[PDB]
Amino acid sequence: VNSFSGYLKLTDNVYIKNADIVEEAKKVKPTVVVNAANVYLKHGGGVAGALNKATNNAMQVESDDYIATNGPLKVGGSCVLSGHNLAKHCLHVVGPNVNKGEDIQLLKSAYENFNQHEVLLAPLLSAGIFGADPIHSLRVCVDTVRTNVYLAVFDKNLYDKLVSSFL
Ligand SMILES: C[C@H](CCN1CCOC1=O)Nc1ncnc2[nH]cc(Br)c12
Ligand SMILES: [Cl-]
């Protein structure tokens, strides 16, 4: 039993809730919160901008040091950094940005990173300002992640659309 409350159980291991991931993280303090990152860990907007703002820019400061040492991530890749005041750890995962023409097949590779963690609070990768189809992102998540994933979706109309169309 875990502290996640109010989720709709989609499958044996995937759960969904209409909520801001930032608020879910503040309430639950999960072991792992997933950030919808880009390769440079420039947390300007979307989930990343919101998570970083909630850390008072500490996430960005840590991320800039990470990039200075290690260089950019790969599309489809990830790194584990601090969760600051939101979680124990933040798993920064880079889903393809469709608006930049990045290969959508890399979305499966992105979700594979979740399998390295037994339980995660996560957003829909490549959705929102990343430009991909959110129904597709949820499908890839369910068909790729085998560990226990709690998906927080902020937009209510999207959440309703995701539930009503789920197979
Ligand atoms: C990944 C999705 C994208 C779809 N969108 C756009 C606005 O609401 C949505 O659900 N974004 C989020 N998901 C969960 N919590 C969030 N907090 C802040 C945002 Br952005 C966010
Ligand atoms: Cl977004």
From Swiss-Prot:
Activity regulation as described: Inhibited in vitro by GRL-0617.
Catalytic activity line of the entry: Thiol-dependent hydrolysis of ester, thioester, amide, peptide and isopeptide bonds formed by the C-terminal Gly of ubiquitin (a 76-residue protein attached to proteins as an intracellular targeting signal)
- Stretches assigned to the Macro domain: 1-167
Q: Which domain of life is it from?
A: Viruses
Task: Cite the record's note on assembly.
Answer: May form homohexamers. Interacts with N protein.
Provide the function of this protein.
Responsible for the cleavages located at the N-terminus of the replicase polyprotein. Participates together with nsp4 in the assembly of virally-induced cytoplasmic double-membrane vesicles necessary for viral replication. Antagonizes innate immune induction of type I interferon by blocking the phosphorylation, dimerization and subsequent nuclear translocation of host IRF3. Also prevents host NF-kappa-B signaling. In addition, PL-PRO possesses a deubiquitinating/deISGylating activity and processes both 'Lys-48'- and 'Lys-63'-linked polyubiquitin chains from cellular substrates.
Please identify the protein, giving its name as recorded: Papain-like protease nsp3
Give the gene symbol.
rep
Mapped onto the parent protein, the portion here is 1025 to 1191 of 7096
